[PDB]
Structure formats: structure tokens, C-alpha cells
């Protein structure tokens, strides 16, 4: 009586149940694991807070309306302030982590709409100015708020044009990245497990984000007659196999 459909994920002191899942994606078919010695470089023993950092943090909720263009969060940024995960983050020189991402959106059998939930490794954004204008730090570190693709261009911020993925590629091809759809008629959640993907064994958690999670409405939300025209979307994310190394004074970052 197991269905692909019902699932439970327990991680730390927190549990999620979905009764309307559509399997789960594990990026590149690899599950998060700690850093092996053969791959290690820094000689420091690392710190593995385990259950105090590897639990589920639910970010603040978004509201899908008929005019929504899509939202974008960066990792580990989105979690920069969650509990002890965040403290560890500002206090060590280097850290590394994988995540379980669970995006939630329920409706009824009269609604229609379909969101794309995708994880993009190394999502370098484009400046809407063109040329070689850079995208300032603050703009690519929105924190739990994430970036709202239907917000206005700002100065020093990225471009927010959806048919171009914020980088000069077409929305249609985002499907080459680990992703899952939430089609109100099928699905009510999306779950993706992200292994740590980098060109170095461990890195800085503040100067470099290693994935952007993106939720994009593709088939517009259509509510039943005289229904309220909107649904909330909630994102809950859990660091998994986290390791921190090179402890010290506590980083100070712009803004």
C-alpha cells in the first residue's frame, strides 16, 4: 500500500509528511555524503553539529497569484539566519552541505496551475544593465526573502526576466537541471535532495552560493469560480551532512 504518493522525511527533530508527492529527485543521482580524506585539503578537523543543523527550516511563505513571475532563493544564503546553522556559517572560515528541499502548494480538484521547481548549480546571474555591469553582493544575497522575479529592476541588482533564467538561457531548457513540477491536478509538493557540488572540496559559505532553488509558475494559476484568486507556496529546506571548518572570529558581511 506504499504509494509513490505518500512520504515521510524525518531529519533531526523535524518531520514532514506529504500525502500527494510525485516521487523525489536526487540530483545527478547522488545523495549528500561527508568529505572524504582522499579529497581533503585543509588540515583542520571539521565540526559536524549533526542534528542541531540538519533539521528542516521553513522559510516565510510566498503568494502565487495570476500575475506571479517566479521566485529565486540561493543556498546557503536562504538559511544564513536559521538557528545554529546560521551561526556556524558566520563563525567558520569554510563549511560544506547538501540539502533536502521540500516545496509545498495545495489547492483543490477544481484549480489548475503548474510550477517548475528546479535546482541550478552555480547560477551566475546577469546584470539588467548589459555590458559588464556587475550584480552587487546584497542583490545576490536576498536571505530568506529570496528574489521576486516580478519585482522591479533595481540598480546593482540582477535582471528578473523569466524567459531567460536570469542569465541568457531559455526557460524551456531548465529541465536539463534536477527539477520536479507541482501540477495542482497531480502533485502538491516537490522534493529534491541536493548533494554538495563544487570544484573545491569545501568553500566559503558567504562569498559563494552553490545552488539557486527556483520556483516558477508555468501554467498560470486558475482558480474555480469566485474562488480567491491566489494560493500560498511554502519552501522548507534542511541542511544535510553539514560540516564546518576553520573556526574563528565571525564574519562581517556587507549590508
Amino acid at each position: 500500500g506504499y504509494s509513490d504518493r505518500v512520504q515521510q522525511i524525518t531529519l533531526g527533530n523535524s518531520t514532514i509528511t506529504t500525502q500527494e508527492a510525485a516521487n523525489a529527485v536526487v540530483c545527478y543521482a547522488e545523495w549528500p555524503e561527508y568529505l572524504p580524506d582522499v579529497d581533503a585539503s585543509d588540515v583542520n578537523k571539521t565540526s559536524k553539529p549533526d542534528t542541531s543543523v540538519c533539521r528542516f527550516y521553513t522559510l516565510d511563505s510566498k503568494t502565487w497569484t495570476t500575475g506571479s513571475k517566479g521566485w529565486c532563493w540561493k543556498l546557503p544564503d536562504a538559511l544564513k539566519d536559521m538557528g545554529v546553522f546560521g551561526q556556524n556559517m558566520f563563525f567558520h572560515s569554510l563549511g560544506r552541505s547538501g540539502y533536502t528541499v521540500h516545496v509545498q502548494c495545495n489547492a483543490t480538484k477544481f484549480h489548475s496551475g503548474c510550477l517548475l521547481v528546479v535546482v541550478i548549480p552555480e547560477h551566475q546571474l546577469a546584470s539588467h544593465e548589459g555590458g559588464n555591469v556587475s550584480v552587487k553582493y546584497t542583490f545576490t544575497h536576498p536571505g530568506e526573502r529570496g528574489i521576486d522575479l516580478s519585482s522591479a529592476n533595481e540598480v546593482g541588482g540582477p535582471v528578473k526576466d523569466v524567459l531567460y533564467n536570469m542569465n541568457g538561457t531559455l526557460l524551456g531548457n531548465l529541465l536539463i537541471f534536477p527539477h520536479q513540477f507541482i501540477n495542482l491536478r497531480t502533485n502538491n509538493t516537490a522534493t529534491i535532495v541536493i548533494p554538495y557540488i563544487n570544484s573545491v572540496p569545501i568553500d566559503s559559505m558567504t562569498r559563494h552560493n552553490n545552488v539557486s532553488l527556483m520556483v516558477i509558475p508555468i501554467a498560470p494559476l486558475t482558480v474555480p469560480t469566485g474562488a480567491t484568486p491566489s494560493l500560498p507556496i511554502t519552501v522548507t529546506i534542511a541542511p544535510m551532512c553539514t560540516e564546518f571548518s576553520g573556526i574563528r572570529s565571525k564574519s562581517i558581511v556587507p549590508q
Binding site: 548549480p121 524567459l163 531548457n173 557540488i197 474555480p224
Partner: protein, 236 residues
């Protein structure tokens, strides 16, 4: 001193030849490799992942909406969409498949075309997808369409339908840039019965459509893509 003779071609530089060269950095030790998920070995590995087709090309500036094929409730007998199968041009051209095919001169193989339905769960519909092999015109009505490769799709719990365009061909390779002799057919879709919405519901519903290549597929003779060009060198 051993006697030699040099042949025609001596001193030429062929950008495609593969020979040994002296290393400028004798004895240098590269950084160790660490493990990174995701290694690609063949472009054939990636063109099997499906991506969305902007089938609804009828707009005037690129929009999220050209990915949406609309469906109308209560129409009978009528046609949902049509396209030829020049995978290197037209709707296909910006898709990952289209985009890679363009790095090669010839392609052969089967294509997989699927449609995912997004209408309310309490609605229902039966569509027919038809592949018309080279030699006939794009079908003009379902009767015409239904006499070639087709699948009656019944919209249900299972949200997507995967149609295969089996390789139908005299010549074993076709050109990726559209060519007549080498042309592959048409793909059309019609109401088999009709879309029906539940009460309290209204308007258009949309289908999303994807394209990817079957394991069947072959691409050969690499060349340059018409999809990118430039007028002055870029700088930092």
C-alpha cells in the same frame, strides 16, 4: 643522418588533427581531481533528457506563454496544433535537442514527443496525436490524420503521454538544417472526443509539450551552429 622526403601538406595547420606537442611547463603538477556529481561523457547522454518546446510560437516577443498549448472545452473533431518535423528549425530550434542537433550535420533516430496535461483534476479529455511520414501533406482533418502513426491519449491520473516518432526513412540519415529530400513528416493533434470542464470552472486549460531523443539516435559530422555569432571580440 637518416634520408627523408617531405610530402604535400608539410607545414599545414589543420584545426582537427591530433598530435603530440612539447609541454611549456615541464614538470608541473596539476591539482588533484576531487569527485563532482554530474559528469557528462557524450552529448548523446544529454539529448535524452526532455525539455519543453515553445510550440505556441504565435506571440510577438518571447514569452512564457509560447510554451503553453491551449485547449478549448466542448470543441469536437477539431485540431489542437500542427508543426513539421524540421528538428533544426522552427519550434524545435531552441530546445536542448534542437540546440545540439545544430552542432552536427546529419541525424538519424527516433524522437520522443510527450504532452503533460495541466487542467483541473475533475475535467477529462481524449486527444489523438498523429505522426505523418514524409510523402503526404500535413493532415487537414483527423480522418486524414488518423491514417498514419497515432496514439489516442485518455487524460487521467497519469498526467503525461509519450508519443514516439519512429524513424521512418528511405535514406538512413537526414540533414539537421531543413532539406526537402531529407524531410521527416508532420506532427498534428486533434480532439478525439473533447475537453470537458467540471462545474464552477472555466476558460482554457493548457498542455505542456516536451521533446527528447530515443536511445536510437545518431548525430554525425560536427559543424558550427547558426545559433550564435558576434561582431567584435568581447572584453572584460
Amino acid at each position: 643522418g637518416l634520408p627523408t622526403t617531405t610530402l604535400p601538406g608539410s607545414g599545414q595547420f589543420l584545426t582537427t588533427d591530433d598530435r603530440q606537442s612539447p609541454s611549456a611547463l615541464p614538470n608541473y603538477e596539476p591539482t588533484p581531481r576531487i569527485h563532482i556529481p554530474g559528469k557528462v561523457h557524450n552529448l548523446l547522454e544529454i539529448i535524452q533528457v526532455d525539455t519543453l518546446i515553445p510550440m505556441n510560437n504565435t506571440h510577438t516577443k518571447d514569452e512564457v506563454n509560447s510554451y503553453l498549448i491551449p485547449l478549448n472545452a466542448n470543441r469536437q473533431n477539431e485540431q489542437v496544433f500542427g508543426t513539421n518535423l524540421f528538428i533544426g528549425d522552427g519550434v524545435f530550434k531552441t530546445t536542448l535537442l534542437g540546440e545540439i542537433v545544430q552542432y552536427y550535420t546529419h541525424w538519424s533516430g527516433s524522437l520522443r514527443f510527450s504532452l503533460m496535461y495541466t487542467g483541473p483534476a475533475l475535467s477529462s479529455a481524449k486527444l489523438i496525436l498523429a505522426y505523418t511520414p514524409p510523402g503526404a501533406r500535413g493532415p487537414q482533418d483527423r480522418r486524414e490524420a488518423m491514417l498514419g502513426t497515432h496514439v489516442v491519449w485518455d487524460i487521467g491520473l497519469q498526467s503525461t503521454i509519450v508519443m514516439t516518432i519512429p524513424w521512418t526513412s528511405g535514406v538512413q540519415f537526414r540533414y539537421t538544417d531543413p532539406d526537402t529530400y531529407t524531410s521527416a513528416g508532420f506532427l498534428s493533434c486533434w480532439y478525439q472526443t473533447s475537453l470537458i470542464l467540471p462545474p464552477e470552472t472555466t476558460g482554457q486549460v493548457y498542455l505542456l509539450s516536451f521533446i527528447s531523443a530515443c536511445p536510437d539516435f545518431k548525430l554525425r559530422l560536427m559543424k558550427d551552429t547558426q545559433t550564435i555569432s558576434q561582431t567584435v571580440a568581447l572584453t572584460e
